[PDB]
Amino acid sequence: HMAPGQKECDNALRQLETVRELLENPVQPINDMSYFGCLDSVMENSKVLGEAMTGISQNAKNGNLPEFGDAIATASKALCGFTEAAAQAAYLVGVSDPNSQAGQQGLVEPTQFARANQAIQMACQSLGEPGCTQAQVLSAATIVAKHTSALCNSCRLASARTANPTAKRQFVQSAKEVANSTANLVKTIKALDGDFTEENRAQCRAATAPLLEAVDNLSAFASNPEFSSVPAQISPEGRAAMEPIVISAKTMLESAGGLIQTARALAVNPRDPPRWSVLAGHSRTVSDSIKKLITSMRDKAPGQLECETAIAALNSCLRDLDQASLAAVSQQLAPREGISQEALHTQMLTAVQEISHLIEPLASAARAEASQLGHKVSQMAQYFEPLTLAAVGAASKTLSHPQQMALLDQTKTLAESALQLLYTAKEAGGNPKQAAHTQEALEEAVQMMTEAVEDLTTTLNEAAS
């Protein structure tokens, strides 16, 4: 018979296999956590798992089997918590890609219901054909009953999950009607008695009509947008962004399973140096996987990827300005055609004014509002496109060489100030408990951008008058 603690290990291993499924093709939210809620959860589950891991080893070593069982159960709970949070974070990452599309969580999958309905329709037709063999009849009845059983099971699960009292009744009653009609149908068939089956083919045919009506009605009820589940469509970019989180979470589950299988043996017999080594190896990998998971999740927090693309954009602008300065000095900057100096000057000032308008709202998001940060840094970076292009244009048409070089330099200085704001905004990231150096660097970046805006505005205002 099984010693205490052994069933706990098997249960945990089964739970880990089940929870791993959440990491395969996440197209729905796992829970109601925000991204920073996910980050909070992994930190808390980390602490719990750590304590359970100590309990697993300590109690396997000391031969305290009831306590060992407890520690295994706790580890399992913590690992399931870990995975749910990782899967939610991964989903949030994937769906937030601009090429992805949002879904909705419901009670029933309308496409699965539609396919079940179609299968049932074809199979009932098959079941009612003239001169069918026994094998043909049993095969058709198998298709019908398999699908009705699935539909009934989904209805019962839906009925327990809905807050809508009418929907609850509808799901329960539909389940009852479909099961009842299927039961009436299979009663006309005997798997190992062909004579009875042949004799009752008329009753079987009659029994298909009420089943078909009840099934078709149920499939329609499922299409009701209030209950329908519609999977998010996650882009290749979205899948690529979420992969480091998924990989880390999968490795944690794999190593944790190894840890549990090893500990299960050590509990029964602790005098086993090779299995203590194996336990330590899995413990190391579980632990490292946790660090990797937490880092991967932090790297994909709201705002982080947008900060990376914004930084890339600003660097591209600085390259263009550098190239323009190089061309101006080597007499190779061709005057731009099909646009006046006045138009270029207006475009510059408009861009500068919009950049200036964005400084404080960007800083506000970087301080305390990660959910707003991505949009603000994108807007900021975008406005350097028209500024940089209009600056190069304006510099190409200026008769004064000092004016030409000053325009490029003051535009470059503003772009460099923006770069520093972007880096510091990324580090701050709307995070709680930012280091003092992080917070002050952000505020200094704000002040320097402001200085840079004023200086370029003065030049543009002086050129205007």
Side-chain angles (χ1 to χ4, degrees), residues 2-160 162-368 370-461 463-465:
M2 295 178 83
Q6 298 289 112
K7 183 75 187 291
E8 281 82 355
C9 293
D10 299 345
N11 287 339
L13 295 165
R14 281 187 287 265
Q15 289 299 323
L16 296 182
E17 287 165 17
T18 299
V19 86
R20 189 188 179 89
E21 294 183 310
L22 302 174
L23 301 169
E24 300 292 327
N25 194 55
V27 292
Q28 289 288 2
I30 281 78
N31 56 38
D32 291 325
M33 287 178 186
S34 67
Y35 203 93
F36 278 78
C38 291
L39 288 161
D40 284 351
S41 186
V42 293
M43 290 301 298
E44 206 177 329
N45 279 295
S46 181
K47 189 184 186 297
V48 177
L49 180 59
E51 297 165 345
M53 287 166 69
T54 299
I56 293 160
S57 287
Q58 183 185 332
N59 293 302
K61 182 188 52 156
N62 297 335
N64 192 326
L65 296 191
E67 281 293 327
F68 171 87
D70 170 272
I72 292 284
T74 302
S76 180
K77 200 181 309 306
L79 286 154
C80 289
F82 251 117
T83 304
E84 285 162 11
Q88 178 81 351
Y91 162 75
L92 290 172
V93 165
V95 78
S96 70
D97 186 76
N99 301 309
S100 302
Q101 310 287 353
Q104 72 162 35
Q105 186 73 247
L107 307 166
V108 291
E109 232 276 22
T111 66
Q112 283 177 7
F113 271 63
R115 192 39 179 138
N117 189 26
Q118 292 184 304
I120 283 157
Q121 284 174 29
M122 286 188 287
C124 280
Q125 165 152 37
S126 185
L127 187 56
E129 296 272 37
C132 286
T133 66
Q134 178 76 355
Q136 279 155 14
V137 166
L138 298 175
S139 176
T142 297
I143 297 300
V144 171
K146 176 170 67 186
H147 286 286
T148 66
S149 170
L151 290 164
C152 292
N153 185 246
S154 294
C155 287
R156 289 176 199 111
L157 295 173
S159 74
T162 186
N164 193 316
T166 312
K168 187 176 155 73
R169 296 169 184 272
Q170 288 262 261
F171 278 124
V172 163
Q173 200 57 242
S174 284
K176 190 195 163 298
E177 287 173 359
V178 177
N180 287 185
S181 295
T182 309
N184 286 342
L185 183 75
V186 292
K187 271 162 186 172
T188 66
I189 294 156
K190 280 175 180 176
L192 292 167
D193 189 334
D195 293 344
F196 178 90
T197 305
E198 183 183 28
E199 274 285 5
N200 290 270
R201 298 278 293 129
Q203 290 92 339
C204 182
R205 289 173 179 121
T208 61
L211 189 140
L212 288 160
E213 196 173 335
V215 169
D216 200 38
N217 292 345
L218 173 57
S219 66
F221 179 68
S223 78
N224 188 318
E226 190 186 309
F227 322 126
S228 82
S229 69
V230 179
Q233 291 156 341
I234 300 172
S235 66
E237 293 94 335
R239 297 284 187 208
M242 63 201 275
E243 186 69 319
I245 299 171
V246 176
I247 293 299
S248 294
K250 282 175 175 177
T251 61
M252 174 189 66
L253 293 179
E254 184 154 338
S255 297
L259 196 158
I260 293 162
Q261 291 209 125
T262 305
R264 189 188 188 264
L266 290 166
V268 179
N269 178 30
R271 292 140 49 91
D272 190 344
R275 274 189 178 84
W276 282 104
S277 178
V278 168
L279 190 75
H282 293 307
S283 178
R284 280 195 279 97
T285 305
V286 172
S287 296
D288 182 64
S289 296
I290 294 170
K291 307 250 77 181
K292 259 66 172 184
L293 179 54
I294 298 166
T295 304
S296 290
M297 284 166 72
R298 285 173 185 174
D299 293 329
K300 301 288 159 57
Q304 291 297 303
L305 289 179
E306 297 94 327
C307 277
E308 187 173 36
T309 51
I311 289 160
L314 264 291
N315 278 315
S316 176
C317 291
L318 287 163
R319 261 177 264 119
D320 291 341
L321 291 165
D322 176 274
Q323 201 67 9
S325 306
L326 277 178
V329 161
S330 45
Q331 319 303 323
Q332 291 174 127
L333 189 64
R336 269 52 177 163
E337 299 163 327
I339 189 169
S340 65
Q341 189 103 50
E342 192 186 317
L344 289 158
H345 284 323
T346 300
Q347 290 179 22
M348 288 187 73
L349 188 46
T350 302
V352 169
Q353 287 170 343
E354 299 286 357
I355 288 163
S356 178
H357 188 63
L358 283 161
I359 297 166
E360 172 63 12
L362 191 156
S364 294
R367 287 180 203 117
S371 65
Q372 291 292 295
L373 182 66
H375 179 48
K376 296 280 162 285
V377 301
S378 299
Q379 283 185 291
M380 180 67 81
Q382 283 166 356
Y383 277 112
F384 282 87
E385 179 270 308
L387 178 60
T388 304
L389 192 63
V392 175
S396 78
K397 298 163 67 70
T398 315
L399 303 188
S400 163
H401 189 50
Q403 186 67 8
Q404 174 177 71
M405 299 312 294
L407 279 160
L408 293 168
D409 189 56
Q410 289 183 15
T411 303
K412 180 179 164 290
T413 296
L414 178 64
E416 283 168 0
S417 294
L419 186 62
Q420 182 64 16
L421 184 59
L422 291 179
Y423 275 116
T424 59
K426 190 182 194 298
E427 186 177 300
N431 284 308
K433 264 291 213 71
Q434 295 172 32
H437 69 264
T438 302
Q439 297 170 307
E440 202 275 341
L442 178 60
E443 300 305 330
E444 196 263 356
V446 166
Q447 298 301 320
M448 297 316 103
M449 266 214 87
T450 298
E451 191 172 280
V453 167
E454 165 170 32
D455 290 352
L456 183 55
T457 301
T458 300
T459 300
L460 295 172
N461 284 343
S465 68

